[PDB]
Amino acid sequence: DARDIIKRPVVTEESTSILDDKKYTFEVDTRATKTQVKYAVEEIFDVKVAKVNVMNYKGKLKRMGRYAGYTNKRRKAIVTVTADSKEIQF
Amino acid sequence: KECVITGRKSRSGNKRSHAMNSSKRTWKANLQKVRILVNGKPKKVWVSARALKSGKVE
Amino acid sequence: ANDIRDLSTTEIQDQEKALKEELFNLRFQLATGQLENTARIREVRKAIARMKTIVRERE
Amino acid sequence: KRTYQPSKRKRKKVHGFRTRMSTKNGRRVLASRRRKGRKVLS
Amino acid sequence: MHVKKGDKVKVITGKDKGKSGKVLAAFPKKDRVLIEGINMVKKHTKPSNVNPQGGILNVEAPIHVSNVMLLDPKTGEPTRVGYEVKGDKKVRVAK
RNA sequence: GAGCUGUACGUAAGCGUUGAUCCAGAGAUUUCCGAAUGGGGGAACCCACUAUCUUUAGUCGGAUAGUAUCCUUACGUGAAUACAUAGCGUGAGGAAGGCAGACCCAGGGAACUGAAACAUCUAAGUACCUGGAGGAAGAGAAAGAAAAAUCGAUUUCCUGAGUAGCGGCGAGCGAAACGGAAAGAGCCCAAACCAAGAAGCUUGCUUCUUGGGGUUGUAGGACACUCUAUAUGGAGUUACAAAAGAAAGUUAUAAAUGAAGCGGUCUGGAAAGGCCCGCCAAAGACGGUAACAGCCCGGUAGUUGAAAUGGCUUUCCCUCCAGAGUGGAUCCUGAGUACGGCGGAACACGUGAAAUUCCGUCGGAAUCCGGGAGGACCAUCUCCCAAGGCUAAAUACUCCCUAGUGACCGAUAGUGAACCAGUACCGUGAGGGAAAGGUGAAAAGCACCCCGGAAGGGGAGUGAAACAGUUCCUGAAACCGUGUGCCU
RNA sequence: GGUAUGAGUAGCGAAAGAAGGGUGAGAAUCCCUUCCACCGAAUAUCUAAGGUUUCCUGAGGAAGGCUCGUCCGCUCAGGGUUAGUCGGGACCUAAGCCGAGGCCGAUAGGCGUAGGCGAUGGACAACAGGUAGAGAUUCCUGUACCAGUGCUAAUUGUUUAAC
RNA sequence: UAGGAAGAGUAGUACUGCCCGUACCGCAAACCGACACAGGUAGAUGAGGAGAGAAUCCUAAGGUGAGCGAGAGAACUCUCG
Ligand SMILES: [Mg+2]
Ligand SMILES: [Mg+2]
Ligand SMILES: [Mg+2]
Ligand SMILES: [Mg+2]
Ligand SMILES: [Mg+2]
Ligand SMILES: [Mg+2]
Ligand SMILES: [Mg+2]
Ligand SMILES: [Mg+2]
Ligand SMILES: [Mg+2]
Ligand SMILES: [Mg+2]
Ligand SMILES: [Mg+2]
Ligand SMILES: [Mg+2]
Ligand SMILES: [Mg+2]
Ligand SMILES: [Mg+2]
Ligand SMILES: [Mg+2]
Ligand SMILES: [Mg+2]
Ligand SMILES: [Mg+2]
Ligand SMILES: [Mg+2]
Ligand SMILES: [Mg+2]
Ligand SMILES: [Mg+2]
Ligand SMILES: [Mg+2]
Ligand SMILES: [Mg+2]
Ligand SMILES: [Mg+2]
Ligand SMILES: [Mg+2]
Ligand SMILES: [Mg+2]
Ligand SMILES: [Mg+2]
Ligand SMILES: [Mg+2]
Ligand SMILES: [Mg+2]
Numbered sequence A: 001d002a003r004d005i006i007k008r009p010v011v012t013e014e015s016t017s018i019l020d021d022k023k024y025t026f027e028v029d030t031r032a033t034k035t036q037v038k039y040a041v042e043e044i045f046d047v048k049v050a051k052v053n054v055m056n057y058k059g060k061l062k063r064m065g066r067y068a069g070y071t072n073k074r075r076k077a078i079v080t081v082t083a084d085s086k087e088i089q090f
Numbered sequence B: 001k002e003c004v005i006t007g008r009k010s011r012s013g014n015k016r017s018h019a020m021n022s023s024k025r026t027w028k029a030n031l032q033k034v035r036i037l038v039n040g041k042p043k044k045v046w047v048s049a050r051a052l053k054s055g056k057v058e
Numbered sequence C: 001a002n003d004i005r006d007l008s009t010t011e012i013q014d015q016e017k018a019l020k021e022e023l024f025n026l027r028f029q030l031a032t033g034q035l036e037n038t039a040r041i042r043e044v045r046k047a048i049a050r051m052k053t054i055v056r057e058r059e
Numbered sequence D: 001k002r003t004y005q006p007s008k009r010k011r012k013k014v015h016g017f018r019t020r021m022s023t024k025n026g027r028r029v030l031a032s033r034r035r036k037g038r039k040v041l042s
Numbered sequence E: 001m002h003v004k005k006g007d008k009v010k011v012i013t014g015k016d017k018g019k020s021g022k023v024l025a026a027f028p029k030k031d032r033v034l035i036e037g038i039n040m041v042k043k044h045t046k047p048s049n050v051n052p053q054g055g056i057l058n059v060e061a062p063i064h065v066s067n068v069m070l071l072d073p074k075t076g077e078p079t080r081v082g083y084e085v086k087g088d089k090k091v092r093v094a095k
Numbered sequence F: 001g002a003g004c005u006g007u008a009c010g011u012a013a014g015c016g017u018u019g020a021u022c023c024a025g026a027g028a029u030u031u032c033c034g035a036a037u038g039g040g041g042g043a044a045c046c047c048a049c050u051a052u053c054u055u056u057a058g059u060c061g062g063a064u065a066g067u068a069u070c071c072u073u074a075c076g077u078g079a080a081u082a083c084a085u086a087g088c089g090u091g092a093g094g095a096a097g098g099c100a101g102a103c104c105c106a107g108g109g110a111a112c113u114g115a116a117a118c119a120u121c122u123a124a125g126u127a128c129c130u131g132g133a134g135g136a137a138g139a140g141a142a143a144g145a146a147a148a149a150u151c152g153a154u155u156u157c158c159u160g161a162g163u164a165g166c167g168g169c170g171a172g173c174g175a176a177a178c179g180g181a182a183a184g185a186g187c188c189c190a191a192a193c194c195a196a197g198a199a200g201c202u203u204g205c206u207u208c209u210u211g212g213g214g215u216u217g218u219a220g221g222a223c224a225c226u227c228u229a230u231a232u233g234g235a236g237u238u239a240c241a242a243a244a245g246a247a248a249g250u251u252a253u254a255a256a257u258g259a260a261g262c263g264g265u266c267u268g269g270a271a272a273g274g275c276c277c278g279c280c281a282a283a284g285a286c287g288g289u290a291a292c293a294g295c296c297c298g299g300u301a302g303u304u305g306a307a308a309u310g311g312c313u314u315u316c317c318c319u320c321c322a323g324a325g326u327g328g329a330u331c332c333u334g335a336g337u338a339c340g341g342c343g344g345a346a347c348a349c350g351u352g353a354a355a356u357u358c359c360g361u362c363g364g365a366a367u368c369c370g371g372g373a374g375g376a377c378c379a380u381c382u383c384c385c386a387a388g389g390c391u392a393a394a395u396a397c398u399c400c401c402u403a404g405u406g407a408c409c410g411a412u413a414g415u416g417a418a419c420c421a422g423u424a425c426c427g428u429g430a431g432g433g434a435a436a437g438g439u440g441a442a443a444a445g446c447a448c449c450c451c452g453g454a455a456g457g458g459g460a461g462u463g464a465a466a467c468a469g470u471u472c473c474u475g476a477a478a479c480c481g482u483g484u485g486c487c488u
Numbered sequence G: 001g002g003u004a005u006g007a008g009u010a011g012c013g014a015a016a017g018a019a020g021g022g023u024g025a026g027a028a029u030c031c032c033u034u035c036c037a038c039c040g041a042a043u044a045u046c047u048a049a050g051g052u053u054u055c056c057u058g059a060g061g062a063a064g065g066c067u068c069g070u071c072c073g074c075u076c077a078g079g080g081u082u083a084g085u086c087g088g089g090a091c092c093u094a095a096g097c098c099g100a101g102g103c104c105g106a107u108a109g110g111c112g113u114a115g116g117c118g119a120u121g122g123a124c125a126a127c128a129g130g131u132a133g134a135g136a137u138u139c140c141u142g143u144a145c146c147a148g149u150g151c152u153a154a155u156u157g158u159u160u161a162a163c
Numbered sequence H: 001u002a003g004g005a006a007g008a009g010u011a012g013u014a015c016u017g018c019c020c021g022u023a024c025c026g027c028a029a030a031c032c033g034a035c036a037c038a039g040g041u042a043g044a045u046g047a048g049g050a051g052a053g054a055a056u057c058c059u060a061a062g063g064u065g066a067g068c069g070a071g072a073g074a075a076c077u078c079u080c081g
C-alpha cells in the first residue's frame, strides 16, 4: 500500500518554512526506499515528484522518573514536486 | 576410526607400573584400511584384522 | 460485522481501501492538529481489521 | 596508554553474537547467560 | 456488587448510619459507591482547575459497598438481596 | 449484567442493556533476528536469482511463491573406460536447534582431601566435559538362586550386616542369597522344514528375497501319522501385529444458586469490641468492611451448570488369529561365537588360590552320544540351555499446573530479587552483582492570608491524629544543638 | 548501616587580568564594550577512530560544576543530520577467517579442496558560488560529468552471418 | 579467438539513478585514563621577520585568559635571579 509507506506529515519551523519552495516533509516507513516514497506520494496526492531526499533519525534517549528509554527511530523524506505540479495542502 | 563390520574402536583403561601406579591409556583396535563392498560399490574402509579373519570381500 | 458478511469479497476489498484512505486522512489531520474527534482513528483501524478477518474467513 | 583501546569492529568480532554462536563453547556461554536471565547476551 | 447506580441504599455503618441516599456512582474495582448527601468532604480546590473562582468545595466521597443495604419499595426497609429468574434475564429479589 | 477506555499522580476524545469492559473454549493475524535454511553478515542487517502478476513511454519501482546442507530412497542423466560404476540433476521422505543448573543411560574422567608424611589405596567413577535420550530410564522372563528339598523374570523397600570378605590386612572399602513386603506379565525371532518366485547356471543341484512354519531341557521343534477348530470362540494398538473411527458416561478449562441481626444500648473518628436480647448452621473456611463479624460484603456447606476444546473410562466399530495328542529314522536349536594366553577394567573382592562379567589383541571349541554353572581345578550329583530381540507395574526426579499444609521467614530475615533485579553498577570478556517495603478509613493530599525570587516557614482549613503533610506507622542509640540547678 | 574524631584543618588540578555598561531577588565568576595578556609546526583549520545527541532554540537553577552562578557539556521541553558523483555497500582481492564433498580423530572436534568472506591496499562520474538558530561537494542557483532508459529522425544489417 | 546473433550503433530530445553514514566533540571538559584528571590519542593543512630550519624569539589568520577569590609580603619549603 502507499498509505503504509507515508506515515504522517512533519510540521516544524523548518518543514513549514520550505512549503512555499514546494518541498513537503513526511515521516515515512523506516523500510521505505526514496523510490517507494516517490511513487507513494504520487498515488496519494496526485502530484509529480522531481526529487525525494531521505534521512534516518536514530531514537532519542528520554528519562521519566528513573525509567530511561529511546523514542522511535524515524525516517524523514523531503519530497520536491515540479513547478507545473499542483501543491500539497497541510 | 572404527571397524565398519564390527564396531571395534579405541577404549580407555590403565597402564600400571610395578608399584602399581596407574595412568590412563587406550587400546586401539587393529584396524586396517581395505577395499570391500558392504554397499554394492567397493570402498576403502577401516576393518579390524579380527573381522578380516575368516570370510570377507577384499 | 454481520453487515460485512452480506457484502461480496470485491465489495469488502473496496471498503478497506475507503477506510485506509480515511485512516490516512485522520492521521494527517492529527499531525497538523486539526482532528478533534481523535477516537475515530481507533474505530477505523478496528474496522479495517474486521474487513481483513472476514475476507480471510472466506478462504 | 591504558588497556581498553575501543574498536566497534573488534568488540563484535571477538565478543559478538555471531562469534559466540560459531563455537560450541560460545553457545554454552549464550545458554549460560540466558539461564541467568541476562538482558544482554553478547 | 449487590447495589448499582440508581439504587436507593440505607447506610448501616460510619458517621452517616441511618441516612439513606441514591447511588450516584459505583467503583466496583475499589468496591466503593457514591451515595447522594453521604460522606461529605471539604476539598481545598486551587482556582486553576474547572471552577475559575476555586475555593473549599463540599462534595460527596465514596463509601465502602458493604456499608450500604438496598431498599425494597414495598416494605421501605433495608434487605439482603437474592436473585430469581423470570425467564429472559434474572432480577434482584428482597427477603 | 453495568459500567468501561491496564499501571500510576493526568488531560482529551469516545464506547456501553440493540448488551460494552471483563472471564473461558476455539479460530484468524503473527514484522525482523535466532537451528535460520536463497547468498553474505559485526544477531535483529545487507544483497540476490527463477517463475507469475502488477506499475511506467521505458529504465527505475511493487506483490506473491520457490531457491540451504546432509541422510535415506525412487527416477533420470553419466567420466577416465567397452559394459558399467563414480560423479551430476530432479522428486519424495527424514534430520538439524533448544532445554528442568533435576532424574536416567553411555563415552571420556580430575584434584584438593584422608592415610596425622606419601607412592599402593582414599577422595571417586565423584566434579566436570561429550553423546544419547524418556516421561521415566535402566533391568527383565534363568546356560539364574540354591543344596532346610526346593524356588521359579526384573525392579524397589525392610532385613541379613557394618556380618562374609577386601585392604601398604594400613586409612578405609564392604556384599549377596535366604526371610519379610510393594508390584506383578509375559512374549517375538534365528534354525530345521514347506510353498512361491528370483537368479547362479555348481546346468535340476546350490544361495538370495518374500510368505508360511517354529521357539525349547530327564528337552522342544521340524518331520511322520491322529483329533478338533478355519472366526464357533479368542485377542488387540502398554510388549505379545497395526491403523482407523463413532457413540455414551465422566473429569478439566468460565460460572450459577446459596441460611441467619440495618436487634437494643455503652465507649468511640468509626463497632466487627463491652453489656443485654435474638437467630442460622450439611454454612463457626478464608478474606474484606473506619477497632476483633456465622447472621454487612465477596463468599463458605450443600445443590446446580458447559456452546467449544482437551483428557480419561466403557461399549460398539474396525483389525488380527489355529491348538491338543502320539512317536525319536533322520534333521534343527544363535562361530571367529564360547573359551584360552597376554594386557586392562567391572565385580564389596587391590591378581590373589580368584570363580563370575566386560574391553583390546592373538589363538580358538563342542555343536545333542551336545553345552554351561554350583568362587582355582577334577570327578560325581544338582540346577540350567549362552553367543538374537521386545516387555507394563512397583522406583527416581520437578522447570511447571491445581488445591492445600507448616510449634518455616517477616524487610540486615525470607530467594540475589516483597520495590520494573539478574536491573543499576563493575569488568575487554567469561563473569561478578547490590541498595531500595509502611500518609490516612477515606485524598478529605493543606482554599485563603502572611514573609520569601524560590525553597522553607507561620497562620487558616481537612482529619481521630499533620509532632500522620506525597516517601509521610513506630521512631532506640551514637552524634549535633538551645536552655539552665550545682561545680570549675 | 548510621555518626563522630582529625577540622573549619589539607585541598580547591600548571596560566593575566582590568574597568565601564547591562541583566537579575541576588553578580569577581552570566552578557556586551574597550584596553591588557597568552598560543601561533599551535592552544589554529580539517579529518579518522572513539563517544552517541553532548549539537540548536526556549525555559530552569534542586542536584552536578572542587567557589559563585542569572551561566553550563547539567535539568525540562521542543527541534536539528537531505548525496547517481563524498566514505562504505549493490566492484576487487591481501593477511587472516570460514569451508560442500574430502582427510584425520574416544565423544566433542581438528585440518583442508572447490568455493566464499575479509581493507589497512586496487578500481570508480561535480565543481564554483549562495544561504543559515542547528546540514551542506548533500539544500538552492549556475555550469557539468557518469551509467542507463524510452521517444523522434536519418543510417546500416538481417545467415559467407552488422553487432 | 571459442561461442551467441537481427538488430545494432550515430545524432537529437526528455526522463531514470537504490541502501548505509552525514548532527556535535575530535591534542579534547564530549575519545582511553573512576574526575570538567598537567598523562595517552593515527593522518591532512600548518603564514611573516631574522633563520639552514617545522629550531629560536616576537607576531598573522585564527584561537585563548584555563570554574575559587581578596589581602599579606614572617619562619620554612619549593621554583628562580
Ligand atoms: Mg543519504
Ligand atoms: Mg571501560
Ligand atoms: Mg455479550
Ligand atoms: Mg538467510
Ligand atoms: Mg595429615
Ligand atoms: Mg449471605
Ligand atoms: Mg458515641
Ligand atoms: Mg486502628
Ligand atoms: Mg482490621
Ligand atoms: Mg583379564
Ligand atoms: Mg576393585
Ligand atoms: Mg568354572
Ligand atoms: Mg581375550
Ligand atoms: Mg566359565
Ligand atoms: Mg564348588
Ligand atoms: Mg567366596
Ligand atoms: Mg540352547
Ligand atoms: Mg533481602
Ligand atoms: Mg523495620
Ligand atoms: Mg521524610
Ligand atoms: Mg592541625
Ligand atoms: Mg595550616
Ligand atoms: Mg591553604
Ligand atoms: Mg583551576
Ligand atoms: Mg616550535
Ligand atoms: Mg550547547
Ligand atoms: Mg555550587
Ligand atoms: Mg541557562
Ligand SMILES: [Mg+2]
Binding pocket: none
Ligand atoms: Mg588468502
Ligand SMILES: [Mg+2]
Binding pocket: none
Ligand atoms: Mg581461495
Ligand SMILES: [Mg+2]
Binding pocket: none
Ligand atoms: Mg566484500
Ligand SMILES: [Mg+2]
Binding pocket: none
Ligand atoms: Mg555546524
Ligand SMILES: [Mg+2]
Binding pocket: none
Ligand atoms: Mg540540488
Ligand SMILES: [Mg+2]
Binding pocket: none
Ligand atoms: Mg559536520
Ligand SMILES: [Mg+2]
Binding pocket: none
Ligand atoms: Mg586532559
Ligand SMILES: [Mg+2]
Binding pocket: none
Ligand atoms: Mg604519538
Ligand SMILES: [Mg+2]
Binding pocket: none
Ligand atoms: Mg588576531
